[model samples]
Target: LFDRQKSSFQTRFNVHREVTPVELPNCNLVKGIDNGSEDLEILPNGLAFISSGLKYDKSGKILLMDLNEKEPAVSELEIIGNTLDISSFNPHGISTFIDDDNTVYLLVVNHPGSSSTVEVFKFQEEEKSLLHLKTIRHKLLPSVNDIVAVGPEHFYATNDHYFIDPYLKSWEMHLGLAWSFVTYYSPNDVRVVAEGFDFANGINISPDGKYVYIAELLAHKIHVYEKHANWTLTPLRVLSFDTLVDNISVDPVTGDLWVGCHPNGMRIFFYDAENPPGSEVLRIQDILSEEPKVTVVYAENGTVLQGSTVAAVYKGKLLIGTVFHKALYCDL
Candidate 1:
């Protein structure tokens, strides 16, 4: 019998791929980040909010870190409200925005038990806590992997599956289905802005808010689209790469894209203690130009960090996060 699904899965995940370690000058494992730092958002002021814990753990936490310290350490930012079920909190990807009055809002992608939800919160600087504001669950954002907040209630989220069932998606994934897509959501209106993605994993916008970027995990592609004033997106260009891109972070100053990727996706989905997955981070500069500059900033064979999901830069510091492993902080 022909095992097309099995072979396709291996090809899509690049199971044969291996890592050639790209060394950095100074890098250290962040203290007290043991479980996972799946995704993170670093503020312009050098403060970072990390979403820790995954399906591998019981409950998830949002951690706070002040990068100004000589040796920055993370402290758990306790949720100060009862609107959400504290016990089943499972956070994945996170994004932030500052309002006109200087109020910071944090949006988190959550998977409680079976389904997915986007939880909105208010950031309290004094208490270093998150105030649960709202839980958004809609048909369009059923399997949200990551969200880029456009406004307090506006979002551009990526979906890896049409139906958020793991078993159902298991079939769709191997069947070579392009059911993954992206959605634009607001208070009363939600629309499918983009479609036909292999696995839309991470979502983000340019600093000027004129362009939106989406990462297709299995396809190994990053798509750029022009974001209109009416909250619609038009496909601009697609950039292909060898590794599987997971999550993306745009530099506010230079407008470069810092992406976390998996050199071998099989090790990520199929966990193995002995042969762990490798981590890779790519820096994309001048993406809109005729020829963009792509550089490997960091890469490792899970010896230091596994399953790199998101990476961002702040004040010459590079913070790389993992899906179910420790976080690495490096000086660039």
Candidate 2:
């Protein structure tokens, strides 16, 4: 039997880790964003699609922010199609894809009440709305945490937990059972590409779409995998870190990785306003190289923003999102 007790809270939760407070000259709280912006995907044209309200709220939404402006503000995109029940819209992570016809598609991970589903939508830029296209549910994507869309209908998703039940998932985490997995989903085929992850939180693909990046939270590791033509993933290398890596965002220009991190994992789950969860952003350059340059772009003690789950850069602007708190927009 595996000795779960050996891995204590110090190692798994990283409670001992401290934030040194790396500061940025120009950073401010994104206006009208309070309930959480868990994950986001930025387009090449400086348009950002942010997923907010996956916590306790009845309605979840996708907010749009044009990074092109000097003072950009988020506008809630209207979900046009009635196929999706707006009342039960619990959006988590999101991905944006542009097809051959220049049609922008947004794939959202939804957790309505208890179960999980992926909602596909067409981004109608002119109307500033999303047209619900399809809702996909599969056995492999039981507890989806995040997704990286390869095509409008094709994606790779991470399941943070093996059991969908909250109670069982806590037990699994406590026991250190790495049953979490990554799944490759297409319209015609769906399969788990990888497994044995402590907590597979965020996932993304390289700019060229040849490599895949996966963030294992509890393990404090980011896995790099080579994507094969037949939809199979071959493990390439693994990068270890001190902080819990939440999301991986690949820069299309330089292929650098912008990672959102949890300096102390315990503070995030066991929310405490007095000693709230801190935030950290890391930039990894030349990830496939022998010595990938890792820089701590931003770090805070959560006095401003708590539980940073994802970060992305558009131009010199950096957006850091939290799990259940406000978002921080900074200049890189």
Candidate 3:
């Protein structure tokens, strides 16, 4: 009984997907950008927005990079209006939406110590930066880990940890508890669409807005859901992984998922101080099928790079973002 309960999730799910081994080409380092980058989103015009700074720190900032250029250039995204309080702008997960009129907007997870909220911004094309529009907050978004924008006024977010007790969250992870959930919020109301997840981390919607993909970190699984008109999510599939999956990004054309994984478990990882954790990137394809395909796009031990948080692709190239170093621009 112990063996069955604690065994690998993949074994329980009976999901066997082919994983192709991939080698990353020589990548150029991006300069003039801060370390501790977490989540990233690529816009329609080939511009990428990056959220930089550690989660628990107040040193957060957004950076813009032109992915259309042969060599990308990074610059700070200046905020134009006072609608946003710049002092408390720590960002975690970000998602972008391009309206029918070609207007761009970014929805960022703003988690400061005291409170958690979602900050909304509009892309100032002429100024080449972001302008603060509004902040979305609700009682259901206490510990939002990620956000996916459905429109300028509506979005879906994941609350990774429950707030029953702050210390209980760590204990829940240690004991393998599935208490987190995904919430849908608009200006009018907030609703819980799904629950029973062990740390709901990254979230993204399909290009056609028909499906939603969420990464459950401690559970080592990817959960897919079909979107409905009543803000309800029906479980479509559950894809398991061998390691702790972090953030998720969906390919616009192929509808494939790119997820960052920590190869090592969380318990034994922080036991040592001198060494860093290993990371892996998995590209999931054919997700609409019962048995999807997974590919290992990149894998690096702590010696090469410690922690990879997000992998944003643009124009057949990969921008590898990390938690503690400069991002690498690699040729696909």
Candidate 4:
């Protein structure tokens, strides 16, 4: 059944919310820092780190959104370096971890030109900026798409594309090749922890560090894993969806998994330019259930909002990230 009474189509696949569009100041078309907003990491103090930049390019910036205010305050985080020259600050996916002594660190997937590296930054609260701690480069992170930090020196990332060649990447996506992988990285070593995924794009770890979630975009799937103390991962469950899954966010208390999805996959990205881009937010509850509770918290199509790459929930609002449009704030 479709609603013909309205001018545009609005269908809620699962749960529905009365969403009011809210815009962030200094992030509009007139403002210069408006870029493709990608990953989001929320701190315990209600501050959110938004990674915004160009896709497959070298330019990007990080915006810190303060959720404490009635109207969220957005500001650019000045990234400073010490030992190494932090020339570029292009960020993709980001994750934060707090040390035993309450030191907060951010792990960012940095892609400057053709080179990919993981940059570690210490959150300097007093200065409201990120201090560059170190830059980590490994063979396993060449095509890293997303990262989740387990500790100050330990994290996991997903390799989205298997081939770097443009032609080969296109073919790999078209043919649905399961060549991508996930890797675990520490100060001393890096190793492949999971493999055989058809584009492992977004990744995250649970609050307790007992589980890991990996999003296989092309395959429309989210892989769940049990993370051991030795940094080993064991396949636990697989959640399938109708739309192309992007990034995944886990609820701290409820253990629900929120996923950003592309209702229309490749066609929206390349072939059909006129096709209205659509986005879906699926919340997975009860992972162990044979038929897990998958609810579409938000679903909309048209030019208003497009492919949702990251869905971060904070203070009863959803901070959405995308590939080509400015980030959105939807009130629940």
Report how far residue 254 has shifted in candidate 4, in Å.
1.2
Error of 2 at 302 (Å): 0.6
Kindly give the number of clashing pairs for every candidate. 0, 0, 0, 0
**Model 3: per-residue Cα lDDT over 218-282, one tens digit each:** 77889999999777889998998876788999889888898877676642234354756655788
Which model, 2 or 4, shows the larger lDDT?
2
lDDT of each: 0.91, 0.91, 0.79, 0.75
Once model 2 is optimally superposed onto the true structure by TM-score, how far is the C-alpha of residue 31 displaced, in angstroms?
A: 0.5
Off by over 4 Å in 4: 1-33, 82-87, 271-273
Q: Which ten residues in a row have the lowest lDDT in candidate 1?
A: 52-61
Give per-residue lDDT, candidate 3, residue 256: 87
Q: For candidate 4, lDDT tens digit of each residue in 48-72? A: 8888874664357777888777677
On residues 4-86, what C-alpha lDDT tens digit does candidate 2 reach at each position?
47656569798778899999978999997988899988899888998998863335889999999999999999999879888
Write down the worst ten-residue block by lDDT for model 4.
7-16
Instruction: Give the Å shift of residue 38 in candidate 4.
Output: 0.7
